[PDB]
Symmetry: none
Subunit: 123 residues, 3 copies
């Protein structure tokens, strides 16, 4: 899994480490991917760059994009959305209703692992 | 400028074409990029893939990620957020208050046009 | 390294496999990343969803987003832009000038692998 988390600037190094740990645990629990396969990028944006309702505010965030190889069930995706959202709301003290999760499914012919396709490798 | 737009499935083809036209016009107006440099990429998400507050709902959308070569002024970015937000709200009949726009600046050493860096091309 | 490649629909399965092989090789060559560390996410978009200059056309693509842990030099990033762009142009028979690359350097405190930060892991 590849998760991108859009965040304002200013969260401490320890909070970012705790968020990476917790979002990885939530991904393993929800969809069962091996922990080693979970990559997370936290994308901090400056205040000048973050819009909600046409005006600048950090309250537009957090937004999480989760990119998965195709084939996860509806139930797995529902669990991923719930657990990623609960985790970021707790770790960053963000209101649950301000958290967004968007999943992209990548067909196994369209996903490369080490220069070979996921379908070539049996995924 | 390269805009990734996250939207639900089911908008008519002509509404998507109107969105591509309008977001291009808004980008030209707001930051003065030539229209021929504006790429609009619409990613439609199925309802199984969209979360707000940890729950499945299309109300999480729309979200626009605007990828720019670094260097726009704060005022230009503010105008881009305002005009893109107004445009997508109008074209999709979506609430302005539900619309998020995030700008990501790419340093000119990190942006490629035709295999050359934006820096080498004087941008 | 994690590459997200936006593409029109219609490229054959073998061409997508060849593209995964070639972009992985370019990444090994340009920046010294072991092949097994390179993940590629091809995101196909329908023709109704892709705009350049405000109108629909596959000429808006390909766009490659290359997510790297921060640390590569400007020289290495310039090489990566050149080689990724030449590779996708050749494999997909796309004009070189239509290729776009956006490198997203992620600070090592802000990137996670297996639940640990890149900095914790020595990256």
């Amino acid at each position: 899994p590849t998760l991108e988390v859009y965040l304002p600037q200013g969260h401490a190094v320890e909070r970012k480490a705790s968020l990476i740990q917790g979002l990885t645990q939530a991904t393993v629990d929800a969809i069962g991917a091996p922990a080693e396969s979970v990559r997370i990028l936290l994308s901090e944006l400056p205040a000048t760059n973050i819009g909600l309702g046409g005006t600048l505010t950090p309250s537009a965030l957090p937004v999480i994009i989760a990119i998965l190889i195709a084939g996860r069930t509806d139930a797995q995706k529902k669990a991923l959305i719930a657990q990623l959202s609960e985790t970021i709301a707790a770790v960053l003290d963000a209101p649950l209703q301000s958290t967004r999760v968007m999943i992209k499914d990548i067909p196994n012919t369209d996903f490369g692992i080490g220069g070979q396709t996921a379908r070539a490798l049996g995924r």
